[PDB]
Design an enzyme around this catalytic site. Sequence first.
Site, PDB file in Angstrom:
ATOM      1  N   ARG A 202      63.991   0.057  17.123  1.00 39.74           N
ATOM      2  CA  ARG A 202      62.721   0.677  17.479  1.00 39.74           C
ATOM      3  C   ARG A 202      62.741   2.186  17.289  1.00 39.74           C
ATOM      4  O   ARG A 202      61.868   2.727  16.625  1.00 39.74           O
ATOM      5  CB  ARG A 202      62.354   0.339  18.930  1.00 39.74           C
TER       6      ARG A 202
ATOM      7  N   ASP B 263      63.449   3.393  13.503  1.00 36.26           N
ATOM      8  CA  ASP B 263      62.259   3.179  12.687  1.00 36.26           C
ATOM      9  C   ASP B 263      61.147   4.169  13.031  1.00 36.26           C
ATOM     10  O   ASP B 263      60.500   4.713  12.135  1.00 36.26           O
ATOM     11  CB  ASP B 263      61.725   1.760  12.838  1.00 36.26           C
TER      12      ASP B 263
ATOM     13  N   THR C 124      58.051  -5.968  18.667  1.00 35.54           N
ATOM     14  CA  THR C 124      57.496  -5.879  17.319  1.00 35.54           C
ATOM     15  C   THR C 124      58.537  -5.414  16.299  1.00 35.54           C
ATOM     16  O   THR C 124      58.240  -5.389  15.112  1.00 35.54           O
ATOM     17  CB  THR C 124      56.271  -4.935  17.215  1.00 35.54           C
ATOM     18  N   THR C 125      59.737  -5.043  16.749  1.00 38.54           N
ATOM     19  CA  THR C 125      60.853  -4.838  15.808  1.00 38.54           C
ATOM     20  C   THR C 125      61.229  -6.135  15.121  1.00 38.54           C
ATOM     21  O   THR C 125      61.886  -6.121  14.081  1.00 38.54           O
ATOM     22  CB  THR C 125      62.129  -4.323  16.493  1.00 38.54           C
ATOM     23  N   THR C 126      60.826  -7.240  15.749  1.00 38.71           N
ATOM     24  CA  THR C 126      61.208  -8.621  15.426  1.00 38.71           C
ATOM     25  C   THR C 126      62.657  -8.938  15.821  1.00 38.71           C
ATOM     26  O   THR C 126      63.106 -10.060  15.618  1.00 38.71           O
ATOM     27  CB  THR C 126      61.020  -8.976  13.919  1.00 38.71           C
TER      28      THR C 126
ATOM     29  N   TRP D  75      69.501  -8.447   4.283  1.00 38.06           N
ATOM     30  CA  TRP D  75      69.548  -8.378   5.735  1.00 38.06           C
ATOM     31  C   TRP D  75      70.334  -9.548   6.318  1.00 38.06           C
ATOM     32  O   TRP D  75      71.198  -9.351   7.166  1.00 38.06           O
ATOM     33  CB  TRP D  75      68.136  -8.335   6.319  1.00 38.06           C
TER      34      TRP D  75
ATOM     35  N   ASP E  99      62.623   4.767   5.400  1.00 38.69           N
ATOM     36  CA  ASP E  99      62.381   3.327   5.523  1.00 38.69           C
ATOM     37  C   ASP E  99      62.823   2.597   4.257  1.00 38.69           C
ATOM     38  O   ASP E  99      62.052   2.458   3.300  1.00 38.69           O
ATOM     39  CB  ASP E  99      60.895   3.053   5.812  1.00 38.69           C
TER      40      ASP E  99
ATOM     41  N   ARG F 212      54.243  -6.971   1.263  1.00 41.06           N
ATOM     42  CA  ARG F 212      55.496  -6.532   0.651  1.00 41.06           C
ATOM     43  C   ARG F 212      56.276  -7.715   0.092  1.00 41.06           C
ATOM     44  O   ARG F 212      56.554  -8.671   0.812  1.00 41.06           O
ATOM     45  CB  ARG F 212      56.360  -5.784   1.669  1.00 41.06           C
TER      46      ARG F 212
ATOM     47  N   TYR G 165      68.063   2.658   7.352  1.00 44.51           N
ATOM     48  CA  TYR G 165      67.319   3.897   7.579  1.00 44.51           C
ATOM     49  C   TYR G 165      68.216   5.120   7.468  1.00 44.51           C
ATOM     50  O   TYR G 165      67.894   6.173   8.021  1.00 44.51           O
ATOM     51  CB  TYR G 165      66.643   3.897   8.957  1.00 44.51           C
TER      52      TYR G 165
ATOM     53  N   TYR H  14      63.572  -0.594   3.690  1.00 45.60           N
ATOM     54  CA  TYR H  14      63.037  -1.923   3.406  1.00 45.60           C
ATOM     55  C   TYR H  14      61.730  -1.832   2.608  1.00 45.60           C
ATOM     56  O   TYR H  14      61.519  -2.581   1.642  1.00 45.60           O
ATOM     57  CB  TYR H  14      62.828  -2.701   4.709  1.00 45.60           C
TER      58      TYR H  14
HETATM   59  O1  LIG Z   1      57.978  -1.674  11.912  1.00 49.65           O
HETATM   60  S1  LIG Z   1      59.191  -2.157  12.619  1.00 49.65           S
HETATM   61  O2  LIG Z   1      58.867  -3.298  13.587  1.00 49.65           O
HETATM   62  O3  LIG Z   1      59.624  -0.931  13.365  1.00 49.65           O
HETATM   63  C1  LIG Z   1      60.423  -2.671  11.481  1.00 49.65           C
HETATM   64  C2  LIG Z   1      60.042  -4.060  10.920  1.00 49.65           C
HETATM   65  O4  LIG Z   1      58.847  -3.964  10.229  1.00 49.65           O
HETATM   66  C3  LIG Z   1      61.118  -4.606   9.941  1.00 49.65           C
HETATM   67  N1  LIG Z   1      60.676  -5.822   9.321  1.00 49.65           N
HETATM   68  C4  LIG Z   1      61.354  -5.911   8.066  1.00 49.65           C
HETATM   69  C5  LIG Z   1      61.813  -7.287   7.667  1.00 49.65           C
HETATM   70  O5  LIG Z   1      62.406  -7.974   8.779  1.00 49.65           O
HETATM   71  C6  LIG Z   1      61.444  -8.169   9.790  1.00 49.65           C
HETATM   72  C7  LIG Z   1      60.907  -6.857  10.299  1.00 49.65           C
HETATM   73 MG   LIG Z   2      56.811   0.815  12.097  1.00 50.30          MG
END
Ligand SMILES: O=S(=O)(O)C[C@@H](O)CN1CCOCC1
Ligand SMILES: [Mg+2]
EC number: 4.2.3.61
Length: 536
Positions: free
Chosen positions: A429, A432, A389-391, A261, A513, A252, A508, A515
Amino acid sequence: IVRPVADFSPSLWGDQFLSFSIKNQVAEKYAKEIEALKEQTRNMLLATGMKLADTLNLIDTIERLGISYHFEKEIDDILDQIYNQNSNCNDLCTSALQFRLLRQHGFNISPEIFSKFQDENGKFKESLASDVLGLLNLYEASHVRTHADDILEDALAFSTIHLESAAPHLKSPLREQVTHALEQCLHKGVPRVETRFFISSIYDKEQSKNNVLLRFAKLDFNLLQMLHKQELAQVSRWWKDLDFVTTLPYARDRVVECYFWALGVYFEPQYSQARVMLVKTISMISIVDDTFDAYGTVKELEAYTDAIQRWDINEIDRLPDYMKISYKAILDLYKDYEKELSSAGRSHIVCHAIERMKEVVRNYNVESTWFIEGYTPPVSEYLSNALATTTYYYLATTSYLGMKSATEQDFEWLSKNPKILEASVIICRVIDDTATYEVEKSRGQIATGIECCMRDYGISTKEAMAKFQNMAETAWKDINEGLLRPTPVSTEFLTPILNLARIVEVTYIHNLDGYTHPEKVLKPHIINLLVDSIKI
Ligand SMILES: O=S(=O)(O)C[C@@H](O)CN1CCOCC1
Ligand SMILES: [Mg+2]
Ligand SMILES: [Mg+2]
């Protein structure tokens, strides 16, 4: 190896942000006038003998106009005095505004201020249904409750149904303010986004507007916008000189959205260095996400994950060429951070973000393993992996790097996964997962949040969606409580975490989504914040 076919929409911005040359004569002119307006406004705040309602409305207006960051001391002093005087003797609009402003600033005012507006049952008096300004302020206040405020349990439903009923017949711009509030409450919105709307669509159109405040707000917004455009130009050049758009075409291409952001996390001029560092991290981890999600093989992702854990340029040779590209860029970026922080003697703090990045990548790899194996974990196991994994642990940690006042103790607090951070992560989390459940289901993802929830509790998709919504509501109450004094660290280090949650809500909105598909939601925000100036 046959890779999956690319599917992401291209960046819709081209090179329109790449070069911005500030007009220094205009910038200096704005700054000079703002200095004068700033002092006039300070004198307004410090005026003696103002009524409570007038004082609260002034502060509220200055905050919504986006110029309150000039007056943090003055506003705090005033709200502290109001908090400690405990005047419980006002109408619904003043009481609800009092409650919201104090709570948003961390003053733990009792929700018993609302008791006089309720019957024996604790339900709001329906006789209040014809008080539109009271309902609007009650509506905004309802979003700042904690777990200790169940007395407000009815406030959102009550204010909403009667604002909806009243709206079509209201004069302007009140009608537009009410309609906007019902789509997006103030407390959960991105500050620059709500400020841009308030200045241009509401305050500019108020018959009773203060001309000094309006001019101040417009000049300040447009002056800051010049800085933001310089930052985005500088960041666009950096991204262009990395050229992932060509060498990593599976990924992306979203550096402008990443900048939005970072701008949401903090917009103030003193966080310029912090914003630029943050957006680079958001961009780069996004590349990694797409590498795990939509390109890399099992074997490649294993090597990539291990290389990240060892964090050593020696490890590049274990990687395919295309992975060498992102791996070197990552190591270099953190070396850039170290040098950038060197003169301030803060280079050592970079290790905190690095350790959080390793965590994200370990959990990315777990997610990949689950996908390949066709594993559907129970919810507790799902969350133990999927929260990182949300970062968001990683981004919150990153947000501190460029903040000059951040100390080792602040990083230490953050490293323990404090409640307010955990809440922001959970919100990201579950929102999303709710928005992306269907498409990920179509792509074979059997370990999606909603799916794990359905299988674990044995409930319908609808019921699982509802449970996730409840988790978000619980987390927002935890965030609000996390802002209350005494705070465990300075409020300055809480607001980025709050703002990360706000960015979720805004991105969101309407369960989509934004982004990955920025056309509907993010594109207008980007234009309003970074392309179009406010007309004066
Ligand atoms: O899939 S999730 O983890 O639910 C959401 C993340 O993919 C969001 N990215 C977008 C850009 O900033 C970093 C994370
Ligand atoms: Mg996801
Ligand atoms: Mg992913």
